[PDB]
Amino acid sequence: GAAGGHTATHHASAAPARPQP
Amino acid sequence: GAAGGHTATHHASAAPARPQP
Amino acid sequence: GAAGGHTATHHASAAPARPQP
Amino acid sequence: MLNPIVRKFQYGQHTVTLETGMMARQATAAVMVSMDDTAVFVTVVGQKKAKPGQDFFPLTVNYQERTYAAGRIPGSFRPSEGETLIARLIDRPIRPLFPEGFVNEVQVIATVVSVNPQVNPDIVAMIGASAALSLSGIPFNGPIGAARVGYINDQYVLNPTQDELKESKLDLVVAGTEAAVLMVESEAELLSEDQMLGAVVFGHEQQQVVIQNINELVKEAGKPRWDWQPEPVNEALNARVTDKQERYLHAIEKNVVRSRVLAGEPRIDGREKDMIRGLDVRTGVLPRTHGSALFTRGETQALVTATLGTDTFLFHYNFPPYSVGETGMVGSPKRREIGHGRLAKRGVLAVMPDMDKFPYTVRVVSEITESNGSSSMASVCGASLALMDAGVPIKAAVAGIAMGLVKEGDNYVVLSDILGDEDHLGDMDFKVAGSRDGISALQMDIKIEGITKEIMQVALNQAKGARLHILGVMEQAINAPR
Amino acid sequence: MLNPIVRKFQYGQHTVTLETGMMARQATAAVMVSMDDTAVFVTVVGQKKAKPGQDFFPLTVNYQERTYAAGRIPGSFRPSEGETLIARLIDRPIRPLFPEGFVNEVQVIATVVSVNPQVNPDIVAMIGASAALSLSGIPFNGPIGAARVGYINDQYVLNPTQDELKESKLDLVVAGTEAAVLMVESEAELLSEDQMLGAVVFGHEQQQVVIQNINELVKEAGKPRWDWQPEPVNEALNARVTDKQERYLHAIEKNVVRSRVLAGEPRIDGREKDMIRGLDVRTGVLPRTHGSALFTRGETQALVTATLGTDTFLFHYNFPPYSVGETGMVGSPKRREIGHGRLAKRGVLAVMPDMDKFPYTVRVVSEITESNGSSSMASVCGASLALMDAGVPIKAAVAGIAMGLVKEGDNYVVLSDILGDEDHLGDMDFKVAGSRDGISALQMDIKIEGITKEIMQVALNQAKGARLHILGVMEQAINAPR
Amino acid sequence: MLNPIVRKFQYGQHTVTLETGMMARQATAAVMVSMDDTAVFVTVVGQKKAKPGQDFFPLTVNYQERTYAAGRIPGSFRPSEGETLIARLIDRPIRPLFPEGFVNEVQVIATVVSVNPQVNPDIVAMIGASAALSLSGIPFNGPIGAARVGYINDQYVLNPTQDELKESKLDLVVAGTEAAVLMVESEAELLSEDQMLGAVVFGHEQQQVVIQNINELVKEAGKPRWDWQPEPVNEALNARVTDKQERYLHAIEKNVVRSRVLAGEPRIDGREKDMIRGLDVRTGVLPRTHGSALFTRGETQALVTATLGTDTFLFHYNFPPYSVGETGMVGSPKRREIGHGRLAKRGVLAVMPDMDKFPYTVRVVSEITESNGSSSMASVCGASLALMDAGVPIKAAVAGIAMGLVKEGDNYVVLSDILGDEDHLGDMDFKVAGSRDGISALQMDIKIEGITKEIMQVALNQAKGARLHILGVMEQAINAPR
Ligand SMILES: [Mn+2]
Ligand SMILES: [Mn+2]
Ligand SMILES: [Mn+2]
Ligand SMILES: [Mn+2]
Ligand SMILES: [Mn+2]
Ligand SMILES: [Mn+2]
């Protein structure tokens, strides 16, 4: 159908974060 | 026998000419 | 076992010499 | 957080998707173009500052197809011949759109990430470069459209698929802006001048939707235009200051030639605007090859050979440094050899016999011994004579010529059989190859606006007579394949 | 008369023979190294005088395996990928030992003349370069040791053979001086932080006998040390003077960043010492490939693809110039691509399914669209998502990160997810790749002394949390292969 | 109108046709040479003006065979080893004929357009370059002749065919002017000094008809001679001003060495005119190869290996930069490796056992660890010892040496085992390889006139004793193949 970031089946995003201890 | 322009089997030449209409 | 000039099976050396006539 | 700016539009029988402002953000611009299932990721990087002593504009277009695009893993396999030719199909239309004086280093990188076996990535990459150069902000007088034109059942077909190209009598690729056509690369089965020209107009009118959609994408996600202006014209220094080898900034000397042609005065070598150079046609030059031919058109000569064996039609093109009387490298295809070789191949491919009547692998090698005006078209003439010498039953004899155009306002002069010096100075390179009945190959490279249907129609008409004149001389030597 | 100076010593289960002062006498130094039956002839040539306007230190390490070494004659076959990787395994530890200011041209040439199928020539060549550079007289703060560390039956094995590597859960190569560890390159089957670190200490302690024996060989046959001193520090001129693309001698500006990090102030982009950049995880980016993934870590992005076919696991790594916003060449592996590609391959090789459960040839191609801090570790993250998209049943999801260290006296700061600018300025490049249960790959490049067990243990602990954070985001998108 | 100037002449059993003044007219000159059915199109381009700061004379000879010449189409296939060797067979005789001080860029391009399987194109190309350089007008002290000399039934044969070379005990290629011999490249089956020398005289006398016919072609179609003269000798600035590595414009220092040798004083290293350097012969240097040998002749050393497998005799030659104590590139055959490798191959090919007695593929690789005088002849000595170590039953042991000559008027000195510095300064490079019973290979490169039968006979006699001395030392180490 199309290519690129918009046609992605699965997506997950996170803001700049400090990892858990 | 030999190579070059002199040993050519067929030859045809024309002076700078204006093509027919 | 090892590589190099020291592990050579056969050896012969000669000082700078003038060949026989 | 990443945000993709997406614009989709219908183009013939396909949907073209343009994505930007998400992937490759450190590049001046970067588009992901998708025509149905075929996708090419195109990136453009333009340097902010020009180098101190730069004499030319450095433009590098890199095309590369990935093996994972078709879902394949490489076996036992530096860009291939196909990748280099498509890179030039992108380079040719975009080059004369950068403003005169622009010297900054610009590189276009197009990589194929997905490919449908029916949709050719070459048009997808051309749209991608058109989208990227317009969104970048880099001074670029586009955007350009890209269209493949077929000819099935006496009708023009926009972007025909690989299966539709089997039925088609035309494989024309056209590129240009909203104003005028810039490039043209084609292959035909002996189509008339009006059929070939109609295809250029058809494709240019159909590709307008591509230009319109890139423009809207620039209105939405386009980077601010580069604040650039060329170094001002200084009048204090400007107003103050037959044989090719003997005769050959001199912008004034370049102007003198242009002004002479427009006035109606004889050309640099002494010829008139429609005159052809001295012709010499020979057959059977080499004793150990199957077919050999030595074609000479003025100071342009080609030693062309034909070899029979038991791709079915191979064409090789060699351009050695001694052809122009210079000392360069040998074996290295200088950004020419691959381009002119396929051009000369497309000029001969139409008259080539069917595999049912003639089941043999034919290789044609052209050796440019002299060069002073379109050695590619001299290779077309030489190939036809070499095939007839080898005994290859080609449908008809084929010849080629290069045409030039100088235009000033509304006054234009069509030049027949242009020289090496007459190329650099003209406004349009125009190469036509074909038989007495039609056109096999047609190439265009235009740098000016105002180029219309009528002017191109007169240009083809003078080209046809120029082609018929050489074919007449070619027939006097040989007219049938062994 | 030729006189060979020979020193033999026990190294694990082998006897290492060093011969010098006989072969290649016009070279600054030349050793014939033999670990059992595997032999590599290593030569070093250092130029006496430095070039006028030299800005960098030119070190070239050339590794080449001969076909006659194994007793073979070449069939139908420019250094191979294996030869280039081993050349870097020699280059990495030796480079930071040349004194700061040394600018003379030094070339190390290691050629394999004999090879035992069980004893790997890569360790032999590293010892050979360590012996040659120390015997030469050229200012070199060595000698370094070379040790391969395995992990068979919960125990560390010094220099395991090719048959022993089949049973081993570790393939760690460690290099460093008597004082501190310099390099580390490894591949593991999900080993813990203490197991990986213990291997570095084990190998560094075992390779001390190599350093001791080279030292004695220098005491016996070493050429007088080069009388060299750098150009004196002039205080008259010294005391007088978030986005990567927008922000980017300035030795003072380099010092400001280092002093800011040690004080506890926010980093160049505004992050804290243990914070990770903004993450974007995507799956199914390309329509015609089997598996596709787009992983973004701040300003570092990788378009990674997976291809299935009917070496069984291939990994390709592309670093185009547009990733940093520059205009360079394409297709040419700039002394990087092969190195980062195998690094990312070693990070994924642990979780790859067995050929009994999954009998398919898998090729993974990574496309670096953006680069600003370890695009090799971004390829590890992208590969895991692309394999899960393709339907490849990998044992566990795998992610990678790059770590930095600034040390001043006894005050040290461990940096998580380092930038492009933060690399050049740090003292230690530290790349860890693995799953939630262990470490698949671990790479070290240290330039400073005082780097001890505890500091490296804290560095791995902060790296583990950094790895677990990305794996958590990766799981939110995809967690199972089709 | 094109007009071909043609001259035919009998040369042995063939008719040599020379065509000019028609094809490739923008080249300084261009000949189509045809010896029977084999044809090579040779072109020469000389630049009118020399570059500002040019230190050397740039001569580039390019040889290329076309696949269409034999009537073939390439399958799955940068000049080959055969093309590079023939290019040097053209370059060697023509180079010292350009006047001392000539600095303009000259390029010779020879392309094979037709080939008879019996007539070798290499002689055809050499005559073509001789014809082109003489017709050009470019200052060239030719023309030279080209002759292949065979030895069938105790008689010399001029230009023997490929079938006649099967019966021949000699494959000698001789080139030179009307006055004196310039080059010589040969391969023999252990022929005596008088048999080898007679072949040089035979070929030089027979090739005179080639020189005579080119001269007449220059009288008819030769371009006016270039009005050139070197920069005058300025006396105001001229009159005003053992180990190789330790010792090494100084035209005066070059003159001092020449004057010392002619006077009878000891050479640069302290040797007399007929003395040989210190020899070191070793066998069984590498443990994993079939045969290994380390031959040392003063400061020239070669690590030579032999490999057995199940072309039948392969020879590889490596010249790394560390051999002279320098830092260069590796793997790239610098216009040497191919030349010296085939030279050393021709020295060993005579003693190689028949395929009926010894049916094995043998590959010999020579590694130049030290270079200070003819590393090619050191490879011949090393190969013989490596073959005997491998168990290859060679007919006899073979050794090689390089000879030098300084001539002044009628006073001449024959130098045995020349150094690296003694080459550049001598007038004649003279390499002889063979057993105790004959000569396997003989190479000549002469730059002076007055070189006659007697002087060359004394040069070979001193070379024979030099060869017998090394063979005596070689026999003391090993004398039979396993
Ligand atoms: Mn791209
Ligand atoms: Mn053109
Ligand atoms: Mn070496
Ligand atoms: Mn780094
Ligand atoms: Mn030529
Ligand atoms: Mn020489």
Residue numbers in the entry:
A (entry chain D), B (entry chain D), C (entry chain D): 1039 to 1059
D (entry chain A), E (entry chain A), F (entry chain A): 1 to 77, 83 to 246, 261 to 267, 297 to 358, 374 to 545
Lines quoted from the article behind this entry:
E. coli PNPase core forms a homotrimer with a ring-like architecture that encloses a large central channel. The two RNase PH-like domains within each protomer are spatially related by a pseudo-dyad axis, so that the PNPase trimer has approximate dihedral symmetry D3.
We find that Mn2+can substitute for Mg2+to support catalysis (S.N. et al., unpublished results), and since Mn2+can be more readily identified in difference maps and anomalous Fourier syntheses, we prepared RNA-free co-crystals of the PNPase core in the presence of 20 mM manganese acetate. In this crystal form, a single protomer occupies the asymmetric unit, and the map revealed clear density for Mn2+at the active site. The metal-coordinating residues D486 and D492 may act in conjunction with the bound metal to support general acid/base catalysis. The RNase E micro-domain is also well resolved in the rhombohedral crystal form with Mn2+ but was poorly resolved in the second rhombohedral form grown in the absence of the metal. Guided by this overlay, a model for the transition state of an RNA substrate under attack by PNPase was prepared. Lastly, we docked the chimeric RNA structure from the P. abyssi exosome structures onto the corresponding position in our PNPase core-manganese structure. The metal is well orientated to interact with the carboxylates of D486 and D492, and the pro-chiral, non-esterified oxygens that are in the axial position of the bi-pyrimidal transition state.
